[PDB]
């Protein structure tokens, strides 16, 4: 992250060891479940690209996930270079150069370059964009490691309706289908895969019932 | 939150990553049980409206809960605008403008505006009011996700009386009935739904016994 | 339909009784299955709006279907009037007036008006548009009478793969989901609901296999 | 088709609605069995390319079959263009232009163009060639939908020999192997897959027996 020194100048502060250890616990203990992404986003809050690569070292022992992340990051860097062609010409002395795809990812840049790029009015946030690339890679990894299809999430004969709903929506978060397909899933498949008593009540409830009304009508069933 | 710099001026400090990760763990692991509210209140202690929106991003993947929160917040902002009509007229240069409903929630304001509004003598606490709106939304969410009715909390044949009492009062906290209805519940339904031996003792104890006396008379039963 | 007399002038010829009887057999014997629509389109080939109302009388004894058709036709006529506002002003003597929604459906027009409107260079086809409105109504009717969800079409343990595919695609034709949802259905649900041996082969076949390759690999399984 | 008016001039007559309905019944009821091809050839007798596209609309709801037909037709149109290069140069006023692949299929042409092309001495039959392309596509479709291999057609213990022969030759018609392979099949596989009593008689009958002699010697067996 970025901190101000006693003289009012922006200084890079490394991630503290217990934050890094929290991220290591997330990576090594949670099997890339969907909650790895909110936790990563919280733990890399306000980070520089050099900090993000420190957090990416924890993924390297997981070769398939690390390779998927590398492919996503290379694709994003190439796309960034294509959409930001390197202008050839003079530059104002008070203006800094334009980082490349290998620079936003911190492969060839240095710490002061990233601090200066991020600390500006108006800012060009290099940490947030690299973070979004990482999150796309992690979404792909969560999709790859998902153990069940949404078609296989079915309410047990004695399972409470809220628990089935939580499992259903967690798998839906993992699968990341298209928006229209997701709407069809939540409207139709949730009712279709409920157990007989809840299914009877939900069918009687009619189409277009909100999830809150469905939870109300199935509370003790 | 708000901190003082070396020059004695109020400065906004972001929520630390492990605090945000604690909130993420609460959201993703506790299924919106009633204790989510004390934990949220502790974790957002002394926060600005911009910090509260960072904590609200964690809820967004939970669509029903996020929508219920959005509806509660929109209702509260509209009510605030109605009860605080925008006065048209001159304002003192030493006095700041009046934030709107979309400003207390931090949708259109900026960080310095919120810092200045909160840091004043006397203060107009924008963090506390937005926090109370969030807590109303969360109370509704806890009500929606509650798995059992208070009518279905019944002491097991071998369950200790203190454990049944704890389950009963936790469900009562979740359900949030009216105050008179809650008093009727704790006075009548708790005794009605106890197991036969404890029920015999409590009936012999008479009406208007305090909960402490009931716990005393049922300790090993 | 429209025929030329011996003098070269366009003349309306009524639908022959055995064509009408074929349509009656379709309506009264097929329970509004999806093939009612291709058959109706073939049997009303080149018809005038007055002929289409003769074919619509056969549906009138089926009150729910007839009412759904009437609602669809009224909606389409209102939309046509809205998108074709009645211009107030002079009209060329060699140009005919503009039919209204109640005129394209033949409620207030006469036979010669429809013949003249359809027989023109360039033509304004009143039969085709009314026919498309009828087809929208019939699609809704086929959806209403569909006995099974697409989620309930599952290959039998000894059912040949081609027969399961035919049932699946016929139900898909009946249900008329969105295009993206239909693509998801044919790509995912067809494989998910196959029987174990065909499912093993199709999973080994990999994603993005064409339906022809799936039929080839499952022929005798 | 093409008809002569009262003045002796060739006029296009549309396909009658009950002919189109017969074709619709063939498409929607017979599951693309091998007899769909003789029926299609009979029902499109003397048709123009514009009529053939009307009959092709009935196949469009069957997406796999429709796509296979479209691929076959595109391939044939490209081959026709390659073998009939568009000559650049003057043309006789009494001679019509040369239709392209998109014109014989009626995508860009008009009705009078096709009537003039077909009605000529000597004729250039555009209906017959497009019909042969359609028939190639339909042969591929019949192959795709075939439920059984020729290797799986085996005489039942009590099945009459003529019925087994009919099933065998119908599957052989569906499969459309090479001519030499088909000759090997009818000479060897038919005898190999017969039931024991008929097999004994056919082996005693010797190689090179005609099918009539085999039917004679197995009549009541």
Numbering used by the authors:
A (entry chain A), B (entry chain A), C (entry chain A), D (entry chain A): 1 to 221
From the paper:
The HIV-1 capsid is a fullerene cone made of quasi-equivalent hexamers and pentamers of the viral CA protein. Along the body of the cone, the CA subunits are assembled on a hexagonal lattice, with the CA amino-terminal domain (NTD) making hexameric rings that are linked together by the carboxy-terminal domain (CTD). Twelve CA pentamers occupy sharp points of curvature—termed declinations—exactly 12 of which are required for the capsid to completely close. Here, we identify a Thr-Val-Gly-Gly motif that modulates CA hexamer/pentamer switching by folding into a 310 helix in the pentamer and random coil in the hexamer.
To stabilize the 310 helix and thus favor the pentamer, we replaced the two glycines in the TVGG motif with alanine and proline. Next, we surmised that the Met66 gate must constitute part of the activation barrier for coil-to-helix switching. Thus, a constitutively open gate (M66A) should also favor pentamers, and indeed the CA-M66A mutant also assembled into T = 1 particles, as did the CA-G60A G61P M66A triple mutant. We solved the cryo-EM structures of these T = 1 capsids to 2.2 Å (CA-G60A G61P), 3.1 Å (CA-M66A), and 2.4 Å (CA-G60A G61P M66A). These confirmed that the mutant pentamers have the same structure as the WT pentamer, with the switch in the 310 helix configuration and the gate in the open configuration. In accordance with our prediction, the CA-M66A, CA-G60A G61P and CA-G60A G61P M66A T = 1 particles were not stabilized by the FG peptide.
